[PDB]
Amino acid sequence: SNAMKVSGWGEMVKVVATNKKAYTDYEILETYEAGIVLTGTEVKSLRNGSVNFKDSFCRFKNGELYLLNLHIPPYSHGGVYNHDPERPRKLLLHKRELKRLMGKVQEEGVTIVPLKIYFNDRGIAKVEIAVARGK
């Protein structure tokens, strides 16, 4: 299901996936909010609250950060338009954030893990990611 929350400023978020294993197994050092480009069928499937982060991870490729092996199930009515459930998905961050994360992800024992997927007060999909170390 979908976890709804209105902030003290009247802004609504809809959390559709939470990486509970990352919260239990890692020390969260720093968090960032990334945008993400999703297809229409992916948005429909995310709104059904059935996505989890099992097997997913973040990796840089050519200076861009990707969320890899997140499984978003097919949309029931997508047919030939259904997305690739595990396509690589680029995370959209500020250049200054990307530069810092490229350094942090090279330190030993430090990795970049996805934490949450949610739709913000404009209806835009976001991924919260973290610089994290194993407990």
From Swiss-Prot:
Keywords: Cytoplasm, RNA-binding. Its main location: cytoplasm. The keyword Glycoprotein does not apply. It comes from the Bacteria. It is found in: Cytoplasm. One of its GO terms (biological process) is trans-translation. Transmembrane segments: none annotated. GO terms for molecular function: RNA binding. GO terms for cellular component: cytosol. Required for rescue of stalled ribosomes mediated by trans-translation. Binds to transfer-messenger RNA (tmRNA), required for stable association of tmRNA with ribosomes. tmRNA and SmpB together mimic tRNA shape, replacing the anticodon stem-loop with SmpB. tmRNA is encoded by the ssrA gene; the 2 termini fold to resemble tRNA(Ala) and it encodes a 'tag peptide', a short internal open reading frame. During trans-translation Ala-aminoacylated tmRNA acts like a tRNA, entering the A-site of stalled ribosomes, displacing the stalled mRNA. Belongs to the SmpB family. This is SsrA-binding protein. It comes from Thermotoga maritima (strain ATCC 43589 / DSM 3109 / JCM 10099 / NBRC 100826 / MSB8). The chain holds residues 1 to 124 of 150 of the full protein.
